[PDB]
Each structure stands twice: as structure tokens, then as C-alpha cells.
Paper text:
The crystal structure of full-length [name] was solved by co-crystallisation with a 25-bp double-stranded oligonucleotide bearing the native [name]-binding sequence motif. A number of crystals and cryo-protections methods were tested, consistently producing strongly anisotropic X-ray diffraction data, reaching 3.85 Å resolution in the best direction. A form of crystal disorder affected the position of the DNA double helix, occupying equivalent positions in different unit cells while sitting alternatively in both 5′→3′ directions according to a crystallographic twofold. However, the first ~30–35 amino acids at the N-termini are not visible in electron density, indicating they are not bound to the DNA, likely due to high flexibility. Neighbouring [name] dimers related by crystallographic symmetry, are observed bound to the same DNA fragment on a juxtaposed consecutive manner, at roughly 90° one from the other. Such organization is associated to a pronounced bending of the DNA molecule. However, the structure did provide two accurate pieces of evidence: (i) the absence of ligand bound within the tunnel of the effector-binding domain, and (ii) a major conformational rearrangement bringing the HTH DNA-binding domains closer together in the dimer such that helices α3 now fit within two successive major grooves on the DNA molecule. That the [name] tunnel in the [name]–DNA complex is free of bound ligands is supported by unequivocal evidence from difference Fourier maps at both early and late stages of refinement (detailed in Methods). The association to DNA thus correlates to expelling ligands from the effector-binding tunnel of [name], at least those that attach more loosely within the cavity.
We had previously identified the transcription factor [name], as a key activator of fas and acpS gene expression. fas and acpS, respectively, coding for FAS I synthase and 4-phosphopantetheinyl transferase (essential to produce functional ACP), form a single operon in Mtb. [name]:DNA binding is regulated by long-chain acyl-CoAs, which are themselves products of FAS I, namely acyl-CoAs ≥ C16 disrupt the interaction of Mtb [name] with its cognate DNA6. [name] is a TFR member that senses long and very long acyl-CoA moieties, subsequently turning off FAS I-mediated fatty acid biosynthesis. We have now determined the 3D structures of [name] from Mtb, in three different states obtained with the protein (i) crystallised alone, (ii) co-crystallised in complex with the fatty acid C20-acyl-CoA and (iii) in complex with a double-stranded DNA oligonucleotide bearing the specific [name]-binding sequence.
Numbering used by the authors:
A (entry chain A): 37 to 224
B (entry chain B): 38 to 224
Write the structure that this text describes.
DNA sequence: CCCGTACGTAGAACTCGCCAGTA
DNA sequence: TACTGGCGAGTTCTACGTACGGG
């Protein structure tokens, strides 16, 4: 065989999203990869190691994109747009990462929760750092506002995706940006 | 009397401490100080017990939010009342916030459906208000309603996981001002 | 008449009797 | 005919859902 490890991680990411962590099985993974379960164990000595490798792959996909987006410009409207774009690009291309982060089913194993937390915190840090440097407010309050902003973006994105993309990505982004800028105050 | 109520409280405790999958009927019976057969006499399945706990918590949150939304037609005020109701929920019934938003049994759609309906009732109420008071068409109004509810829940989870570094009144006012004026009014 | 105990069983993460290609 | 190397056919352990001894 060739490097089956890469194809196994791709298949496992596909399978975990459909079944959930607990329901996914090594029998199902071997079945869909068309490889025997002992060979899979030859590559990954435990189910947890495979899970942490998938989680790490998805977090890095999102985080490098977010950092690169946040380094493009010092114009708050611009860094706002770049970050929201990075978020929508992630949720559209890596559907499995999206499901694994927002529909995580194995919180009972702290290494799992830590990978999720570090991924959520990278987003919070990028928004917070810009707001803190460019606002001078209370440190505690700025992080809370950054978290709210990130959460709002993810929830809008989840609405869009769960509705079978009823509007264009450009429309979803523009709506989110306009809402982030003028808030509820400019809706009526 | 009817031990059922105390059992639901104990089951909520066990699910929050251990998580759904790790929780066991043996542990719930142990902490309630009852035998496992009596627990099965009251709740025929772990899923049924979980759904009963979940339903209790959802009704707890949603009635508080809806009643908040009926107090006044000053949209800024109903924004504050609803967010306050949400923070109030997350502070008293600490176990419920975790059970709804840190849900570990995605494999059983009736669970996910009860969660979806709780989020959607709040979203529907906000959407209905935006549509009547803004002339916004459905897609944009619903997207904004979803954004507002998600933002409030995430702010509350940050605040609670950070051990409440500011007062709820402070937490509430900061959240409302950010929701109202957006980033344009942050510096 | 009824609670605490001790168990059957299901399901799945992990391993062992086959099976194909050489001199 | 024998040696390498990967696969169906067990093993066990864990935890849900019930059948013997006290009050």
C-alpha cells in the first residue's frame, strides 16, 4: 500500500460527521476505507490518537486562515471583513471541520476539549487583540465582546449552511458585516 | 411524596458532571440514594430520562425569554429584557445551560430537535419583531435574529467560564450596547 | 408488601486461524 | 512444500436493563 494514513484521516473526517464520535466505529471506518481493521490499527494504535489528529488538522486549517486574514490590514472595516470571509470560507470548504467544532460529541476526554478550546480561543484572540489595541477599553469586556462577535458569525454561518445556502456567500458576508457595523440600531 | 422531581434534579446533576455517555443509571441511583429498579419504574429509558431533563430546562429558558419579550414594545428594552432573561437562566440553572449547549447525544434526533426548537422559538420571536418594526424581508431579518441569539449565548458562556469577572448588570449592559451599536461604537 | 444485590446481555474496541506467492 | 504478511472470527469489558435476599 501507499501512504494510507492520509486517505484514512480524510475518510474518518467524512465518517465522524455523519455518525458522531460515539456511533462511529472502527468496523465502519474499515468498511468505508475498504481496509481491514488490523491495518487501520497498524497506522493508529488508538481511536483517540486518530481523533486528535483529525481535530488538529481542522483547527490548523481554520487558524492559519484566520491569522493570515488578520494580518492583511489595520483598517477595522477591512480586518472585520477579512476575518468574516475567512470564517465563511472555512465553513463552506471544510464541512467536516465545521461539524467537528460546533457539534463536538466527546467532551469527556479533555485532550478533545482542549483542542476545541484552543481553536475557539485563536479566533477570540484575533478579534480581541484588534479591538483591545484599537479601543483601550476594559480587557475583560473586550474579550467578552470578541467572543460574542465570533459566536454571532458562526451562528449566522450555521443558519446559512443548514438552510441549503438560500442566498449567496457574498450576500451572507455583507449582511454579517453590515450588522457588525451598525448593529440592531440600524435595522428598522 | 413523588420522588420523580428529585430524580430529575439528580439526573441533571449527573449528566452535567459526567456527560451523557459517561453518565450511568447506576451513578444516578447512587446519588439520589435510590435503587436502580425504582429509577427504571419512573423513567423507562435513559433517553426518556434525558429528554425529560432537557425538556424541563428548555421550558425553563423559553418561558422566561418569551415573558421578557411581552413586557414592552420599546425594542431596545425588549433587547435588554431578553438578554437579561438569558443570563438569569444561565446563572440559576447552571446545569441546563451546559446540557443544552454542551450536548453529547447528537445520535438521537429527538434530542437535537428539542434543542433546535428552543433556539428557533427565540429566533422566531426576534425575527417577528424585526419584520414588523423594520420592513426587512425574511432572509435578512432571520439571519440577524440568529446572529443576535448566537452572540448572546456565546457571551454568556464566556462570562460563566471566566468565573463571572463582572456583574450581570455589567455583563448585560456590555452585551446590549455591543448588540445595539456594533463595532462602530467600540473605540 | 417492598428495597438493595447480583446478573444477562449487547455492542464495540482490540487481537488470532487463514491464504497467496516463491523454488 | 515452506515462509511472510495481512484478514474474518473471537475476547473481554463496560454499562444498560432485571431476578434473589431483608423490613
Amino acid at each position: 500500500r501507499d501512504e494510507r494514513r492520509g486517505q484514512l484521516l480524510v475518510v474518518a473526517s467524512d465518517v465522524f460527521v455523519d455518525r458522531g464520535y460515539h456511533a462511529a466505529g472502527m468496523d465502519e471506518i474499515a468498511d468505508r476505507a475498504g481496509v481491514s481493521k488490523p491495518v487501520l490499527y497498524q497506522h493508529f494504535s488508538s481511536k483517540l490518537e486518530l481523533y486528535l489528529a483529525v481535530l488538529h488538522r481542522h483547527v490548523e486549517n481554520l487558524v492559519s486562515g484566520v491569522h493570515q486574514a488578520l494580518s492583511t490590514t489595520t483598517d477595522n472595516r477591512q480586518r472585520l471583513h477579512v476575518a468574516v470571509q475567512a470564517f465563511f470560507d472555512f465553513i463552506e470548504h471544510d464541512s467536516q471541520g465545521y461539524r467537528l467544532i460546533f457539534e463536538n460529541d466527546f467532551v469527556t476526554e479533555p485532550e478533545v476539549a482542549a483542542q476545541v478550546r484552543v481553536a475557539t480561543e485563536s479566533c477570540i484572540d484575533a478579534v480581541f487583540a484588534l479591538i483591545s489595541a484599537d479601543s483601550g477599553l476594559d480587557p475583560h469586556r473586550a474579550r467578552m465582546i470578541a467572543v460574542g462577535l465570533v459566536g454571532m458569525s458562526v451562528d449566522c454561518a450555521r443558519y446559512w449552511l443548514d438552510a441549503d445556502k438560500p442566498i449567496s456567500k457574498s450576500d451572507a458576508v455583507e449582511g454579517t458585516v453590515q450588522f457588525a457595523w451598525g448593529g440592531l440600531s440600524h435595522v428598522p
